[PDB]
Amino acid sequence: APAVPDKPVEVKGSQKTVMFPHAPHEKVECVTCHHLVDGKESYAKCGSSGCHDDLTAKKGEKSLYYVVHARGELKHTSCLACHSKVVAEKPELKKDLTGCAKSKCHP
């Protein structure tokens, strides 16, 4: 694989950018997030062309918002899906990991 980013990286939506830190995710398998595509590894940006390249819609597979924020049933684990499980076990982190405002994603 390519080297994991060693600093927070931009995740660009259509109007907001959220910084994503790899370090707290070191125990998460890369493929949880960088899931296989057509049975092959890929580490391309989630919003690249042909992937989750609808940066304005809130719903549906092509939506970057949806694959980040859906709490619902998805074929891969979303940020908010996993974080909901983490905060169940570490409730002190509820706002940090799941808040829509004043969270670590949206400070």
Ligand code: HEC
């Ligand atoms: C989800 C919790 C992740 C885990 C686990 C890993 N990465 Fe990641 N990575 C993730 C995101 C949301 C992003 C930003 C993507 C975007 O569209 O902006 C990244 C980015 C990278 C990159 C750079 C991609 C690019 O700019 O072309 C690389 C090379 C990368 N990630 C590698 C990587 C590896 C090797 C991991 C396991 C050691 C790994 N990531 C875990 C989300 C997540």
Ligand code: HEC
């Ligand atoms: C294009 C090569 C992609 C890249 C890069 C990323 N994703 Fe993706 N994703 C892609 C497809 C073709 C699909 C549908 C088939 C499948 O593998 O399930 C998905 C699916 C997801 C999902 C589930 C969506 C749903 O069930 O509606 C999630 C949560 C998801 N992808 C997340 C995700 C993230 C966070 C990515 C960057 C780290 C990412 N994908 C890259 C195609 C592609």
Ligand code: HEC
């Ligand atoms: C589980 C499979 C995860 C997925 C998918 C994502 N995150 Fe996560 N995140 C996870 C853990 C276990 C932790 C650490 C909690 C703890 O016990 O401390 C985190 C933490 C973050 C943070 C906070 C980091 C800090 O400020 O100290 C951020 C900003 C964060 N995660 C963002 C994030 C995003 C944007 C994700 C989807 C692209 C995402 N996480 C996925 C576990 C998991």
Ligand code: HEC
């Ligand atoms: C980190 C785990 C996040 C938490 C908690 C919340 N959001 Fe978020 N949000 C996150 C990312 C990685 C991004 C950028 C990628 C994308 O387009 O989704 C965003 C962006 C938004 C936006 C702007 C969308 C755009 O196209 O610019 C909105 C309006 C937004 N987020 C809403 C939102 C709400 C309502 C939240 C509480 C449920 C929330 N976010 C939490 C990552 C994270």
